[PDB]
Amino acid sequence: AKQSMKAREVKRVALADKYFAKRAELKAIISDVNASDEDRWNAVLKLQTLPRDSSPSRQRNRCRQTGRPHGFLRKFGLSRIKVREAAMRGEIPGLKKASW
Amino acid sequence: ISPHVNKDARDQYEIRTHLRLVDIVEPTEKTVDALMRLDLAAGVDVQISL
Amino acid sequence: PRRRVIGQRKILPDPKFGSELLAKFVNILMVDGKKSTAESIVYSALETLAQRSGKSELEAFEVALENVRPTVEVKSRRVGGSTYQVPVEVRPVRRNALAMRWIVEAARKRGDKSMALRLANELSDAAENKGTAVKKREDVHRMAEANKAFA
Amino acid sequence: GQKVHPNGIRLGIVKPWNSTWFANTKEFADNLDSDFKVRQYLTKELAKASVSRIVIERPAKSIRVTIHTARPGIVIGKKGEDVEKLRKVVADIAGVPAQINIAEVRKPELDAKLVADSITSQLERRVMFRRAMKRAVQNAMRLGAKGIKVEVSGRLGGAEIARTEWYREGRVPLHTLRADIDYNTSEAHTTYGVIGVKVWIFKGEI
RNA sequence: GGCCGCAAGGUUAAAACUCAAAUGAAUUGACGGGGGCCCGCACAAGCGGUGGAGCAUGUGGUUUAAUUCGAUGCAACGCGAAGAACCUUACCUGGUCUUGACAUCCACGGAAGUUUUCAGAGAUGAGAAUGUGCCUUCGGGAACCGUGAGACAGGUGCUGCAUGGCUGUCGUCAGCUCGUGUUGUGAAAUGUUGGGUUAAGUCCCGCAACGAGCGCAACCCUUAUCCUUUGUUGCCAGCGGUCCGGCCGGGAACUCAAAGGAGACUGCCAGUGAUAAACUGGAGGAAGGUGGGGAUGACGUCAAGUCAUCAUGGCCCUUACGACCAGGGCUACACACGUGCUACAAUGGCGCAUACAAAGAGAAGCGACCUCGCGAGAGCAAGCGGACCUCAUAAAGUGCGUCGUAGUCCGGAUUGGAGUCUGCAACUCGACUCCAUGAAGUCGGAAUCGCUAGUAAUCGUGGAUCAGAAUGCCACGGUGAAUACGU
């Protein structure tokens, strides 16, 4: 990928770590029943002033060696191509070709 | 296994995990000391419960 | 095939009576791996057919088949650029197979209310020498007779 | 057609792994990334010490790294002054206690990685590729192997049409799973583009 | 032009101009509507589909500000995509920056928590509080935030006809070659052909050949039958307690779990055959002649695919083809094609109520019991990093009623109203629930595809990507056929 995309990813992760607790509090306010019914309106209006990049759902998994946004596996942190390269070189403990 | 189109031509891999369980019925102080003062290989994961 | 010999598969006999012919019939009637339904239909049909003629189910079935078993048929040959019908003899296993197949195909095209009723009607008509099964036998025999010159 | 990787198809039958540790799903990825960075650093730093293999182990909360080399003197240095620096940097990268061991390769002429590295180095200084390949094969068969194969591909000699050539001597049975075959590769960057090298070496059945 | 002939014509016989070749005999291939032998769901014998309808999805074309780029006979078209509402994003319109959003250098001062106005936001301005560590021999500045100048950074921009690495296909076909010797002036040949046999350049016997290599078989995984070890979380024939339930005390026998071993070799019997290699039968045995299923892809062909995973030669732009930001588009619609799902009904639809599996996943996770709602769901809360808890109730099936051949009590497109959940945010453009509406279609022209046994056909179950979004892809079991005379 380009150099700017990984920069975007790092920025997103940082902000999402920074603003975690505030969002949890506001969402507890909005979700909980028997609330004042005006604190609800104020909280809904306030949750949209925090920066957009602070929501965990704006993040996209990428391979840690190249940056590819498609074909990602979670157990290994890499894409299919690099998984196969490492596997044949012998660098993934326990992995081997399977038949049955 | 191809960097572009071809949609057949796949590879299938496997990982296996082996598990064992051992019971000690009447531990003594010397036994617990001996156990806790042991070291084993670097590919074996050991968990001890009282 | 080209260089193969194929053996014969064993077939379990029916549970009510003990005939492999009826088992082959049930097999030829079944669809989509539902053997119990086919067994129900066949047994109901034989029950409703035994009364009409006052004889055992096996005897009625045999009588029905003996009027649809064929003897000669026609194959197609083309070596000189033209298609010729050549008459050949049929062997007993193929006789039985063709008879059952034609019976079932004729039954499926009728217009009664249930499959058991249609099958019983077809079997009775065949015993009486009427219906599409006997018509098919006659047509095949006519076609075989019309081409005796090519034997 | 296409061929299967010899090392990969043989793992678990006659060949050992290069990393031996257990982990769970929340540490697997991070362990792999750390290993990749350690290997990258060491390979860059010891570029002239004839390194062929790095074996990594992770016990307890520590990392221990074994380097296989054919020139231990250059790596160790004057009473360890270089091994110490390596250990410090590796511990900084791994984030835990670190330990380093050195093992010696007796015969460099029967190791696949070093042969390929030598051929690539020669090609970069404008040597004849036929000369390089024939020398490699002759040395291997002289020092006691049971078979060798060498292959070279690219814009050989400055040509405009690419090409591929290979040489062989002895036995190299690739469909036999109990045969002990060593395989590895290397790349050369010339003034006309990339050239690739592959080396197969046979040693006997097990 | 002369000579001859009734004629048709015969005989003697040039030049201008134009090209760099035209030709004989043999050699290795490829091809034949030439011959001979042999194989494969190739035909034949059979069972179920596609081509017609409605919907899902990819492609061509047309349209638009933009509808981002790539794949194109078999061997592109549910293909890169294992999951486009913003992000992803590479495309369009408008607002902005210039040593730069991402690294190395120099020198001028200082670092993170909360909170106020103006912007769609990027981004400008006011404030309040704090003084970190650490040879301070004062030079530490490591750690990390500012501005300033120039070496530089940056490019999903072009060429896969400059390349490395990786992949498709002929083809899981049985072939493809070398050293020494001998033959021919030579290109080359022999070996590798011949008589038998096999799934097989598999094996034997002959022969100017004698030997070796890459392929074929075998060593690797799984499945089916046994005995020896260890028995919790898994198992209950005998024994003995009863609130009936492996519950409780117990037992190590059986299912089962996972480490070591045994077994199948044409090994034994009869016949045929060159006193061979083999072939057709039989005994025992869980299994018989490659027992069934995988992985494993020879020298090479198609300037086959990929500079948009990654790396790289050469070219091109640097206040712009490099940065950042909110809205839109990749989801358009006269039409043409490929791949699928649901049906066109009594071997069936609807209502009651009752047997029998396998393999998997789970801490920003899987969510029992209880209560509330017609329902999707909501509240309060045990257990579980797991042979223990949770996802989790298999369906087709069997038993009893109703419907009686109707565009129907078959089918479930489209559209109106009211809701639930994830997420800052569901207009363009999400999945699901309730009430209502109830379209096409009665088995599909010329063509054309899959399958040889636990196979086709039919019924249910799980996982990867993933906040949410499968009728696709990859895996698991239940019921269970028809036909092979022959080339």
From Swiss-Prot, chain A:
Keyword Ribonucleoprotein: yes
Pfam families membership: Ribosomal_S14 (PF00253)
GO biological process, alphabetically ordered: cytoplasmic translation; ribosomal small subunit assembly; translation
Keywords: Ribonucleoprotein, Ribosomal protein
Domain of life: Bacteria
Gene Ontology terms, MF aspect: rRNA binding; structural constituent of ribosome; tRNA binding
InterPro entries the record matches: Ribosomal_uS14 (IPR001209), Ribosomal_uS14_bac/plastid (IPR023036), Ribosomal_uS14_CS (IPR018271)
GO cellular component, one term: cytoplasm
Protein family membership: Belongs to the universal ribosomal protein uS14 family.
Cited function: Binds 16S rRNA, required for the assembly of 30S particles and may also be responsible for determining the conformation of the 16S rRNA at the A site.
Binding partners and assembly: Part of the 30S ribosomal subunit. Contacts proteins S3 and S10.
The name this protein goes by in its record: Small ribosomal subunit protein uS14
Lineage of source species: Bacteria, Pseudomonadati, Pseudomonadota, Gammaproteobacteria, Enterobacterales
From Swiss-Prot, chain B:
Signal sequence, renumbered to the chain: none
Function: Involved in the binding of tRNA to the ribosomes. Part of the processive rRNA transcription and antitermination complex (rrnTAC). The complex forms an RNA-chaperone ring around the RNA exit tunnel of RNA polymerase (RNAP). It supports rapid transcription and antitermination of rRNA operons, cotranscriptional rRNA folding, and annealing of distal rRNA regions to allow correct ribosome biogenesis. In complex with NusB is involved in the regulation of ribosomal RNA (rRNA) biosynthesis by transcriptional antitermination.
Assembly and interaction partners: Part of the 30S ribosomal subunit. Can also form a heterodimer with the transcription antitermination protein NusB. Binding of S10 to NusB is mutually exclusive with its incorporation into the ribosome. The rRNA transcription and antitermination complex (rrnTAC) consists of RNAP, NusA, NusB, NusE (this protein), NusG, SubB, ribosomal protein S4, DNA and precursor rRNA; S4 is more flexible than other subunits.
Family that this chain belongs to: Belongs to the universal ribosomal protein uS10 family.
Protein name per the record: Small ribosomal subunit protein uS10
Organism field: Escherichia coli (strain K12)
Full-protein residues shown: 53 to 102 of 103
From Swiss-Prot, chain C:
A GO-annotated cellular component: cytosolic small ribosomal subunit
Gene Ontology molecular function: mRNA binding; rRNA binding; structural constituent of ribosome; tRNA binding
Keywords, alphabetical: Ribonucleoprotein, Ribosomal protein, RNA-binding, rRNA-binding, tRNA-binding
Role played: One of the primary rRNA binding proteins, it binds directly to 16S rRNA where it nucleates assembly of the head domain of the 30S subunit. Is located at the subunit interface close to the decoding center, where it has been shown to contact mRNA. Has been shown to contact tRNA in both the P and E sites; it probably blocks exit of the E site tRNA.
Family recorded in the similarity comment: Belongs to the universal ribosomal protein uS7 family.
More info: The strain K12 sequence is shown.
Subunit (UniProt): Part of the 30S ribosomal subunit. Contacts proteins S9 and S11. Cross-links to IF3 and the P and E site tRNAs.
Protein name in the entry: Small ribosomal subunit protein uS7
Residues of the full protein shown: 2 to 152 of 179
Curated annotation (Swiss-Prot), chain D:
SMART domains (alphabetical): KH (SM00322)
Gene3D superfamilies in the record: 3.30.300.20, Ribosomal protein S3, C-terminal domain
Coiled coil feature spans: none
Any one GO molecular-function label of the UniProt entry: rRNA binding
Keyword hit for rRNA-binding: yes
InterPro entries xrefs: KH_dom, KH_dom-like_a/b, KH_dom_type_2, KH_sf_prok-type, Ribosomal_S3_C_sf, Ribosomal_uS3_bac-typ, Ribosomal_uS3_C, Ribosomal_uS3_CS
Plastid is among the record's keywords: no
Keywords: Ribonucleoprotein, Ribosomal protein, RNA-binding, rRNA-binding
GO terms, biological process: cytoplasmic translation; ribosomal small subunit assembly
Pfam families: KH_2, Ribosomal_S3_C
Ranges for domain KH type-2: 38-106
One Gene Ontology cellular component annotation held by this UniProt entry: cytoplasm
Family under the similarity heading: Belongs to the universal ribosomal protein uS3 family.
Subunit comment: Part of the 30S ribosomal subunit. Forms a tight complex with proteins uS10 and uS14. With proteins uS4 and uS5 encircles the mRNA as it enters the ribosome, which may play a role in mRNA helicase processivity. Some nascent polypeptide chains are able to cross-link to this protein in situ. In collided ribosomes contacts ribosome rescue factor SmrB.
Family matches, as HAMAP family: Ribosomal_uS3_B
Known role: Binds the lower part of the 30S subunit head. Binds mRNA in the 70S ribosome, positioning it for translation.
Record protein name field: Small ribosomal subunit protein uS3
Lineage, uppermost ranks: Bacteria, Pseudomonadati, Pseudomonadota, Gammaproteobacteria, Enterobacterales
